Amino acid sequence: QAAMGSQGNLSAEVEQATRRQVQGMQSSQQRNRERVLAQLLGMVCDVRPQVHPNY
Amino acid sequence: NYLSQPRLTYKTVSGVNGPLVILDHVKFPRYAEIVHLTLPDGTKRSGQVLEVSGSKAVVQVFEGTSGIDAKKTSCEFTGDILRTPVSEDMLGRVFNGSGKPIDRGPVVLAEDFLDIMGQPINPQCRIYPEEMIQTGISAIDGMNSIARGQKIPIFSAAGLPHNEIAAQICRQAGLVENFAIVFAAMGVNMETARFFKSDFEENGSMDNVCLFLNLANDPTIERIITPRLALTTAEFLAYQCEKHVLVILTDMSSYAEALREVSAAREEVPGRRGFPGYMYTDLATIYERAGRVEGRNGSITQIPILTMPNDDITHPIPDLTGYITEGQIYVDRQLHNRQIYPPINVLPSLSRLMKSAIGEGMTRKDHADVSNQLYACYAIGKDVQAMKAVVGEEALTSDDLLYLEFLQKFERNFIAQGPYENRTVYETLDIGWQLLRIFPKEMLKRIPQSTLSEFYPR
Amino acid sequence: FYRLKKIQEKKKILKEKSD
Amino acid sequence: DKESTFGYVHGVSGPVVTACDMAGAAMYELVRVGHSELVGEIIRLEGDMATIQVYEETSGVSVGDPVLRTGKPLSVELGPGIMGAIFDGIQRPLSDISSQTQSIYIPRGVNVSALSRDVKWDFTPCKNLRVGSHITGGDIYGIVNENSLIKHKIMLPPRNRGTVTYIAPPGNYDTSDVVLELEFEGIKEKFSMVQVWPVRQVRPVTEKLPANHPLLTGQRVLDALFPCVQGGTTAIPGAFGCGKTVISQSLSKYSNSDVIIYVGCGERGNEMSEVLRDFPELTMEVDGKVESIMKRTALVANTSNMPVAAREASIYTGITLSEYFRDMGYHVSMMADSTSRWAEALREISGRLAEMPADSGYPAYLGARLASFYERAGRVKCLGNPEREGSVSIVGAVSPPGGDFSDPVTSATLGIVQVFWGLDKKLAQRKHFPSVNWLISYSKYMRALDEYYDKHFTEFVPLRTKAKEILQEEEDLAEIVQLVGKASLAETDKITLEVAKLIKDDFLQQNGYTPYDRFCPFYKTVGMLSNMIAFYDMARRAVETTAQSDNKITWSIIREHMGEILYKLSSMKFKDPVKDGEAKIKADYAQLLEDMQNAF
Numbered sequence A: 001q002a003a004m005g006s007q008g009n010l011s012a013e014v015e016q017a018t019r020r021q022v023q024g025m026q027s028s029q030q031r032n033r034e035r036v037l038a039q040l041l042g043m044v045c046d047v048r049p050q051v052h053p054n055y
Numbered sequence B: 001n002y003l004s005q006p007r008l009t010y011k012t013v014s015g016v017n018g019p020l021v022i023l024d025h026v027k028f029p030r031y032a033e034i035v036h037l038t039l040p041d042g043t044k045r046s047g048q049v050l051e052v053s054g055s056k057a058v059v060q061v062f063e064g065t066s067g068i069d070a071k072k073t074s075c076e077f078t079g080d081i082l083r084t085p086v087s088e089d090m091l092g093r094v095f096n097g098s099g100k101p102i103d104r105g106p107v108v109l110a111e112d113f114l115d116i117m118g119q120p121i122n123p124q125c126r127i128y129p130e131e132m133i134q135t136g137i138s139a140i141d142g143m144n145s146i147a148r149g150q151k152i153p154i155f156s157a158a159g160l161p162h163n164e165i166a167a168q169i170c171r172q173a174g175l176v177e178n179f180a181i182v183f184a185a186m187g188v189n190m191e192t193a194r195f196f197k198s199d200f201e202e203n204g205s206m207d208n209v210c211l212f213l214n215l216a217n218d219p220t221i222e223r224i225i226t227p228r229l230a231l232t233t234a235e236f237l238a239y240q241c242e243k244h245v246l247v248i249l250t251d252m253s254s255y256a257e258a259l260r261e262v263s264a265a266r267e268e269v270p271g272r273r274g275f276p277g278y279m280y281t282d283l284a285t286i287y288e289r290a291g292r293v294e295g296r297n298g299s300i301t302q303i304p305i306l307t308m309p310n311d312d313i314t315h316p317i318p319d320l321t322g323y324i325t326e327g328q329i330y331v332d333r334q335l336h337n338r339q340i341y342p343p344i345n346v347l348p349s350l351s352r353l354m355k356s357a358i359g360e361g362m363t364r365k366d367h368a369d370v371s372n373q374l375y376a377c378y379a380i381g382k383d384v385q386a387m388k389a390v391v392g393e394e395a396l397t398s399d400d401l402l403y404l405e406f407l408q409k410f411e412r413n414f415i416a417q418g419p420y421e422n423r424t425v426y427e428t429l430d431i432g433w434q435l436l437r438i439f440p441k442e443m444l445k446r447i448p449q450s451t452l453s454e455f456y457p458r
Numbered sequence C: 001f002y003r004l005k006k007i008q009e010k011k012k013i014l015k016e017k018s019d
Numbered sequence D: 001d002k003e004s005t006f007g008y009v010h011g012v013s014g015p016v017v018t019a020c021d022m023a024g025a026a027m028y029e030l031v032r033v034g035h036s037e038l039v040g041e042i043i044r045l046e047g048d049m050a051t052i053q054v055y056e057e058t059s060g061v062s063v064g065d066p067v068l069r070t071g072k073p074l075s076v077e078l079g080p081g082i083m084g085a086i087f088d089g090i091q092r093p094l095s096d097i098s099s100q101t102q103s104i105y106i107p108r109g110v111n112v113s114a115l116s117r118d119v120k121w122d123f124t125p126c127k128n129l130r131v132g133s134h135i136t137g138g139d140i141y142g143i144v145n146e147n148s149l150i151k152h153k154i155m156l157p158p159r160n161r162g163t164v165t166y167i168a169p170p171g172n173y174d175t176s177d178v179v180l181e182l183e184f185e186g187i188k189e190k191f192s193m194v195q196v197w198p199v200r201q202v203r204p205v206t207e208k209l210p211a212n213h214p215l216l217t218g219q220r221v222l223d224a225l226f227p228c229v230q231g232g233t234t235a236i237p238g239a240f241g242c243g244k245t246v247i248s249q250s251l252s253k254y255s256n257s258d259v260i261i262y263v264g265c266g267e268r269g270n271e272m273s274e275v276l277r278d279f280p281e282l283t284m285e286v287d288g289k290v291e292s293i294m295k296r297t298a299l300v301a302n303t304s305n306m307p308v309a310a311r312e313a314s315i316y317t318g319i320t321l322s323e324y325f326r327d328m329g330y331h332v333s334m335m336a337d338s339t340s341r342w343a344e345a346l347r348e349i350s351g352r353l354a355e356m357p358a359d360s361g362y363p364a365y366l367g368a369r370l371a372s373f374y375e376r377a378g379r380v381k382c383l384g385n386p387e388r389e390g391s392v393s394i395v396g397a398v399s400p401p402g403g404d405f406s407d408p409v410t411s412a413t414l415g416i417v418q419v420f421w422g423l424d425k426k427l428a429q430r431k432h433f434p435s436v437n438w439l440i441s442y443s444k445y446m447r448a449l450d451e452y453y454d455k456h457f458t459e460f461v462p463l464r465t466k467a468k469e470i471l472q473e474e475e476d477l478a479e480i481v482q483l484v485g486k487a488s489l490a491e492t493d494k495i496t497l498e499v500a501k502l503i504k505d506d507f508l509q510q511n512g513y514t515p516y517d518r519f520c521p522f523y524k525t526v527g528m529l530s531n532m533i534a535f536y537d538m539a540r541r542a543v544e545t546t547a548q549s550d551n552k553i554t555w556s557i558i559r560e561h562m563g564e565i566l567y568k569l570s571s572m573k574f575k576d577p578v579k580d581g582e583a584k585i586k587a588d589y590a591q592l593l594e595d596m597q598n599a600f
């Protein structure tokens, strides 16, 4: 009884809870992606050449 | 706020001996700065700048100087001190000594970057530890009880079961809503790493356990930053995410033996038995990173395991640990050959914060008095046992036979409990009161007549 | 041993100046 | 002679910093190294460079960083706003750091003034110091009641003098308001309620006096066997678990000292956090009123997690605050929590300077820094015209490694101090607190205290002399018991081995957390000692007079006859003197003296 019921605990987690976590953050990545890349590439192109504070 | 300048990459090594690489022509070198060596054969090694002088930088590498050229190796100066990517997702994963994952996983996604050296807490905003942790061991919860925010080592030796009672106080760690355990293993074997890893998965506790395991074949300068990594994530969980953290720094004698080789390579001034003069301050930078503060609801408790050499409490490993911490737990060799599972000799054990964590509102009224009498009846009967071996088994006073009746009933019934039994503190004090029943009422000097009238007739 | 190795490190530095 | 105002770092290796471009800088000058201005102090200079020990963490200090010279030594700000407060080694208020930054750390670059310039203090003049009157160095020209306990008397600095051209009227003043103005050769020097004084400079004073009044710590073995005077130096060695702190906490709560300055030099952080917890809920009664003992306590907290070179600056700060309250006429008592962590700070700084070591790695000047710290104690007649007397008692606990008293920090301390309360580890393997080993401990304040004892408690001097013979002759005969056996003892020796067990369990043992033994007044110390010595004298009279002739007393019937008197003698530690009157308790003893005379 412990060997047969342990397989019913597998599909309650390996495809129910796990697979909803990937698409749960796949949607949240797609909503906030283009705001990040405009912030990220803004810092790569804003070169401010400084010298060391100890000259 | 953030570094934006590109990194200088020097090929200007001018000296290497032991673990120390000496670069020249470094432009404004920084103390305690991290560099990134790339070897002529292509492998990467990290380093830390240990002394600057003008344009030179004496960097020690974390992996050893075996193969470092004087012309072909290239050293890239990261412009900041050693920070680690810390996150809430570092809870349920295992890591090696340096920073890296071991369990086939990805890198940490870095909620923020914390300095591993830390910064000491203001002693005005540090509050006293009060809530007693009931750890389910009668030698602890009876006479050497720990608090929530207490640093307390397990003084062990070689071969004694200090790994086993480390995994036993992980399962039964609760109050008299679980502990986020952070585990640091330094200088351990392969079986000792598998004993802790397969025990944290057996009890289902590996959803809140961050293992920092550094094996015996791992480099001995990565053992220095192993407790600094495992305490800078424990400060992130306890002082920012408001979590109650249990930190276990197992084999602390493997940390300080790895501290002796680095200082002897630098030719530092030696203290006792070759250990450096700053061993007290270097141990206290990882022992005093514990307790709870006034603005937060989290706490961090440290249980650092160490094995004393030659069963000696006057070696510099357990002697300097007693001056920093708040009492010790002393397992014994003589109580291990008798197959008592917790071999906790209670006489050189201590809990400096047990007086504030027991009492009427905490556990019950009789706790502070039965523990002073269980300690004195144990100390007299060991003096009697050291007397009957010289004098004889028959030339004793009849009062001295009760002290032999106590000790044979003390070690097998009070402290011996088995590896999965978790006695509560009300179970313990009703077992500890049974052993005082074999003495008269006016031979118990430490317990007054008031609380003797409420507990001793039973 | 530490007092004699401290002196042999100091005598080497004075012999690196007089070169 | 151009005197460049800046310097630049040349190399940093741990706590020390080599700074180039530093030409006309003096030794022990205060500099500020780094962009965050870490506080440092110049200890060595070789030509153009200068070497600086830093009282902060030098992790992150680059080479081209500026080092600005201040031209002044390391000094403290002395004035109102200093009782009840807690400072670190360089005297930054930890209560004002945690409220300015609203965090739980010390940001290691903070320049907070030691005394706040916004608290209004109610100044009152001396009432006999008119305008035009002369005033020398060190006399009181004002009284500021800091609390209900401590009247913080404002004094002129010991250097300068003159005539009063202006003295402020009574009212509320800041620490920055000018109170006094003087003229000497025709120069106007204005004075406020604070003064700045270097910590390595001994405070000037009129004349030193011998010490006569004792320091009653409250502990029974400490007041009776090995007494200490106010104005005396005391060392408490001992390993971990012996109770070096509990003797220091019980002496800061219940002694007869006016103010208390507690210096945690490199010890546990939770020990300085339990001080400011149970002190404001503990009061004392001096003039019919009760006020908490935190109003007479100042803390200097530099834990072992904190920087290393600031262990030295926390010792010299705590003695300079102790000599400041000395000059008001108070009886200061200073508890350096560990002078063995200061000696480990000198060793690590000397390891970076590549100095030649003395024995066990300590520098050769270790015994000279300990000598110039304990010599600043003493009962001494203060400078100034109101003609008062002050005192400083230094009780510094040594932490020897491994419990070895043949340690170059302990052996350098015992050549300086006059009292030595050597704690023992085996007296903590059985719960015998206070764990003072009575065999190795001593006190050289015996010829100074017998004139006090022959004026107040005249019976006490042969009491402790006889109690020191019982405790010593027990050790001579317990060596025979563990080798030969108890059966070969005489009747004058079996009485000694059991009155000594009465001494070590009733008189010497004292549980500080019980309300009857948290403080033992000195009439109770002599009261339960004059009973247990006379009982030994009476039981000696039942042996030597009945020597051989009749059927004599072989001590086995004294146990049987006086079975309640041996309970009357072993329970006198219970005769609570907080809630039990002195006259009550004293009467209870003399009654037990009457019961033994009737029973013998």
Ligand SMILES: Nc1ncnc2c1ncn2[C@@H]1O[C@H](COP(=O)(O)OP(=O)(O)O)[C@@H](O)[C@H]1O
Pocket (backbone or CB within 6 Å): B322, B323, B351, B352, B353, B355, D239, D240, D241, D242, D243, D244, D245, D246, D433, D434, D510, D511, D512, D513
């Ligand atoms: N009078 C006493 N009664 C009971 N226990 C005591 C007494 N005095 C000291 N102790 C015990 O001795 C311990 C020593 O504390 P502490 O002084 O901090 O150790 P250390 O000497 O290393 O500083 C205390 O925590 C307490 O448990």
Ligand SMILES: [Mg+2]
Pocket (backbone or CB within 6 Å): D244, D245, D267, D268, D271
């Ligand atoms: Mg202490």
